[PDB]
């Protein structure tokens, strides 16, 4: 549990868990690459405890547009759903307020790790974005396809100067 700990000094904040590091008898506390106290020997019982910082992360608000609706979804980035209606777990984080829908649509609002969100039209849904429509070509070693007509396309390209 997130506690304010003090072990012969070493004042800090975090959660203390049992560890398996092999401290030499003269060593009191450990330090990670980047110099962050990662472990500590408690003076009383001489046990080795790992220190893990309390859960933190960013909060993103997925909005379908104020003019459309006032519903929102909340994404907690890099946070497990084991901590703080619908709750869904993604490689991006914990998504609350969005019902996962297992039909693939084009990406409307990028959540991450291949998962997007959109206003169902009614509620905000989360889905796995689709790359496109499968079209196997009829490959054969003696068949060709030749176009019998054409169209003329006028594309528009904007370039800042």
């Amino acid at each position: 549990k997130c506690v304010n700990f003090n072990f012969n000094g070493l004042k800090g904040t975090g959660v203390l868990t049992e560890s398996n590091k092999k401290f030499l008898p003269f060593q009191q506390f450990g330090r990670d690459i980047a110099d962050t106290t990662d472990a500590v020997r408690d003076p009383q019982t001489l046990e080795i405890l790992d220190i893990t910082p309390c859960s933190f992360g960013g909060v993103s608000v997925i909005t379908p547009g104020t003019n459309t609706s006032n519903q929102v979804a909340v994404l907690y980035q890099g946070v497990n759903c084991t901590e703080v209606s619908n709750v869904f777990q993604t490689r991006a984080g914990c998504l609350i307020g969005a019902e996962y829908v297992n039909n693939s649509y084009e990406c409307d609002i990028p959540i991450g790790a291949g998962i997007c969100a959109s206003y169902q039209t009614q509620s905000i849904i989360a889905y796995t974005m689709s790359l496109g429509a499968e079209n196997s070509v009829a490959y054969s070693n003696n068949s060709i396809a030749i176009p019998t007509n054409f169209t003329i396309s006028v594309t528009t390209e904007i370039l800042p100067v």
């Binding site: 933190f56 992360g57 990028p110 429509a133 054969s140 396809a145």
Partner: protein, 314 residues
């Protein structure tokens, strides 16, 4: 593309210090502009990947009977017998490149590795079963020994030079593909140009962590001792040097990241152009798609980049 980084400004500059957070609000739009810059960089990385790989419209598939006139594409076509449906060469590429710490977090990319692999597979299937026709309209399908004839016409060599040497030509191609993998296995630093950015990013981030230990001329780099052993008149002034120093280091990091992202954007624009001319067509541009008279090209995915296999006539 780069890694999509993010920084919680408070926790880097303050940490567990409440007084530091109270003081930091005086500066205002510093953390806002740093967050906007990093968000722009991340969105730009996703855009880079999207522009390079998502050129194809439909997701094409290759026929079950994989006979293409004697040309063997097994080393570039995906292998279903693996959890990741990547090709034999792409697997070597991912194996050869080896890839919540106090406010510095890394955002996952929007496109997963399997999605980029599926895009690459669609490009390969379209190139093999349609030629260059799938990038300029409807994907019209032609026999592969007849794409090669068209491309020989493209480099200024008559059609029959293919048909009279087809088997020989096929074998040459096959052998080259084989040697390619050995080359990728031989020189460890062959993909160094693709590892460097990774290394570079780590270096920058490492420096940032190191900058959290510097005193910046103060009595110590730990906020707790400064707040405990000192009176407010000097403590708050001592902290001001630790906030100014940390803000300067963070701004330096953001500026360096902006320059690096500009470089990566230039590289991604070049990669998209290579995908357009080299892969979706045949390039008369002299040295753009490999040494020798360009015949065709094949894309392969890599952890933060693209590998082009340029088949050329010498």
């Amino acid at each position: 593309s780069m890694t999509k980084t993010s920084v919680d400004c408070t926790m880097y500059i303050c940490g567990d210090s409440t007084e530091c957070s109270n003081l930091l609000l005086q500066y205002g739009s510093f953390c806002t502009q740093l967050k906007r810059a990093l968000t722009g960089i991340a969105v730009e990385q996703d855009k880079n990947t999207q522009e390079v790989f998502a050129q194809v419209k439909q997701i094409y598939k290759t026929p079950p009977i994989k006979y293409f006139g004697g040309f063997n594409f097994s080393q570039i076509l995906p292998d279903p017998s693996k959890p990741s449906k990547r090709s034999p060469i792409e697997d070597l590429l991912f194996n050869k490149v080896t890839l919540k710490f106090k406010g510095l977090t890394v955002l996952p990319p929007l496109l997963t590795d399997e999605m980029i692999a599926q895009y690459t597979s669609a490009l390969l299937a379209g190139t093999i079963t349609s030629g260059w026709t799938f990038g300029a309209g409807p994907a019209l399908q032609i026999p592969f020994p007849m794409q090669m004839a068209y491309r020989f016409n493209g480099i200024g060599v008559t059609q029959n030079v293919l048909y009279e040497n087809q088997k020989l030509i096929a074998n040459q191609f096959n052998s080259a593909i084989g040697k390619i993998q050995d080359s990728l296995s031989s020189t460890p630093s062959a993909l160094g140009k693709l590892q460097d950015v990774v290394n570079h990013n780590a270096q920058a981030l490492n420096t940032l962590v190191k900058q959290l230990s510097s005193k910046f001329g103060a009595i110590s780099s730990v906020l707790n001792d400064i707040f405990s052993r000192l009176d407010p008149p000097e403590a708050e002034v001592q902290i001001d040097r630790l906030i100014t120093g940390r803000l300067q280091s963070l701004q330096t990091y953001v500026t360096q990241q902006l320059i690096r992202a500009a470089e990566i954007r230039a590289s991604a624009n070049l990669a998209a152009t290579k995908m357009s001319e080299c892969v979706l067509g045949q390039s008369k541009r002299v040295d753009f798609c490999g040494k020798g008279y360009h015949l065709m090209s094949f894309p392969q995915s890599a952890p933060h980049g693209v590998v082009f296999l340029h088949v050329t006539y010498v």
